[PDB]
């Protein structure tokens, strides 16, 4: 988890949870917190309590703070997610292994939400996206770039106008690019016929 490769932590916390399942369970109540935290931050899992040994202990009123978050993460509900952090503050925000990865987890959703919001739009205000995700403009503007840098959000920013024009303008780019090649081959071809004769 510390190293980043959550695929090698995820499976580690399933086997350790099973050893506390057989014998003593001082860590079993907090070991499932790292099995679920993996599956969310694994950015794919989103299926913890449907496994095997987590079925009868999903009810457990200690880890039920994390049961509200996995579906909130899965459904991409932020106002719900952040409400669970405020109320269940002692459960989640006191643990230093959940306090570290809290924001990286919040992003993974934030972006997810934004993708759906922008999809229908072509051009959109930053001030509106600010209010929508509920966040400072600068921080939004920043986050937008990153998605574009890694190339998930197809879009570009007009910094002066505080907006986001979105990639979409699609037309017959094939005809022109294909003909471009034919134009080039003829260029090199006719000179090869001239260099034959003298």
């Amino acid at each position: 988890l510390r190293e980043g490769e959550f695929e090698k932590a995820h499976t580690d916390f399933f086997e350790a949870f099973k050893n506390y399942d057989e014998s003593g369970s001082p860590r079993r109540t907090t070991c499932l917190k790292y099995l679920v935290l993996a599956n969310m931050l694994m950015k794919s899992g989103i299926n913890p309590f449907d496994s095997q040994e987590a079925k009868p202990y999903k009810n457990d009123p200690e880890i039920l703070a994390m049961t509200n978050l996995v579906s909130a993460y899965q459904n991409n509900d932020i106002t719900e997610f952040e409400k669970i952090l405020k109320t269940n503050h002692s459960n989640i925000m006191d643990d230093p292994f959940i306090r570290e990865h809290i924001e990286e987890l919040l992003r993974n959703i934030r972006t997810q939400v934004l993708i759906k919001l922008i999809k229908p739009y072509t051009r959109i205000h930053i001030p509106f996206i600010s209010k929508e995700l509920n966040i400072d403009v600068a921080d939004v503007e920043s986050l937008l770039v990153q998605c574009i840098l890694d190339n998930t959000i197809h879009g570009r920013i007009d910094q002066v106008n505080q907006l986001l024009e979105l990639d979409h303008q699609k037309r017959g780019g094939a005809r022109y690019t294909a003909l471009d090649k034919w134009t080039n081959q003829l260029n090199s071809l006719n000179q090869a016929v001239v260099s034959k004769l003298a």
Binding site: L179, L186, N190, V193, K196, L197
Partner: protein
């Protein structure tokens, strides 16, 4: 009379000529089998979106006769419903067809048996040995009103626009206009513009014969009619078919594209004709 005649509307219908030919093959083949005319019956299928309905393809159905009542053997329909859902998985069940006169009691009894299957069954009827100079293929639907204290079924007639598919249109243009030893020297522009030539002949035939009525109506003696001449006033001013600043730009946009393709294509032919000349010069004249 057992048809509707009222202020209709409802759905808007299209019609593929493949459907006409699949019925035509089905009539001629079943006619030929028994040495007499036959009332063949079959099923209709195609695309259905919102109100509008297109009929794409058509096939046959099994039928029997309890007394004088035509019984659609439904056990056959459900069997063919399997096989047509396989090949055309997109297509839906729409209606049915038959041959003979106009709508009548013997088809209303059959329309009830199709009404058990679906909630909006269309109905085509074709007259094989027709007296009409027009087409004898009319489309209908089920409508029900109070016939003096009696709720009962009727047929509201509807019109049909023809199908457009470019691949199909050629099929029509090939069998209805056959090259039976009618092209020797390739020509290419002869084998292409033959389509437009006699197609526009139809356009000119129609447009002129309307104008013959227009001149004679005002001239007099030829019956003056308000409700026909009215549509002509629209027809002729409703022309200038797109002189919008945007449209023509787009038209010229296309032309230039095609032009580019000709410029490159001509350079290619020149380039070959050049190299045809080059090699013949660079061997006979030149010493390699």
């Amino acid at each position: 009379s057992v048809m509707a005649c009222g202020v209709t509307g409802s759905v808007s219908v299209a019609l593929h000529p493949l459907v006409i030919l699949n019925i035509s093959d089905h009539w001629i083949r079943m006619r030929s089998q028994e040495g007499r005319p036959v009332q063949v019956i079959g099923a209709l299928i195609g695309k259905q979106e919102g109100r509008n309905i297109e009929v794409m393809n058509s096939f046959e159905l099994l039928s029997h006769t309890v007394e004088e009542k035509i019984i659609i053997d439904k056990e056959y329909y459900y069997t063919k419903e399997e096989q047509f859902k396989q090949v055309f998985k997109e297509l839906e069940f729409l209606g049915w067809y038959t041959t003979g006169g106009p709508p009548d009691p013997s088809d209303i009894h059959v329309h009830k048996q199709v009404c058990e299957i679906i909630e909006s069954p269309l109905f085509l009827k074709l007259n094989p040995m027709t007296k009409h100079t027009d087409l004898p293929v009319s489309v209908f639907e089920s409508v029900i009103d109070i016939i003096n204290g009696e709720a009962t079924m009727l047929f509201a007639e509807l019109t049909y626009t023809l199908a457009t598919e470019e691949a199909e249109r050629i099929g029509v243009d090939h069998v209805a206009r056959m090259t039976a030893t009618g092209s020797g020297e390739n020509s290419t522009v002869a084998e292409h513009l033959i389509a437009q030539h006699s197609a526009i002949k139809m356009l000119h035939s129609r447009v002129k014969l309307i104008l013959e009525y227009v001149k004679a109506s005002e001239a007099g003696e030829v019956p003056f009619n308000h409700e026909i001449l009215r549509e002509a006033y629209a027809l002729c001013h409703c022309l200038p078919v797109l002189s919008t600043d945007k449209f023509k730009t787009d038209f010229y946009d296309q032309c230039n594209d095609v032009g580019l393709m000709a410029y490159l294509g001509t350079i290619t032919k020149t380039c070959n004709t050049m190299n045809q000349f080059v090699n013949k010069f660079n061997v006979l004249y030149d010493r390699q």
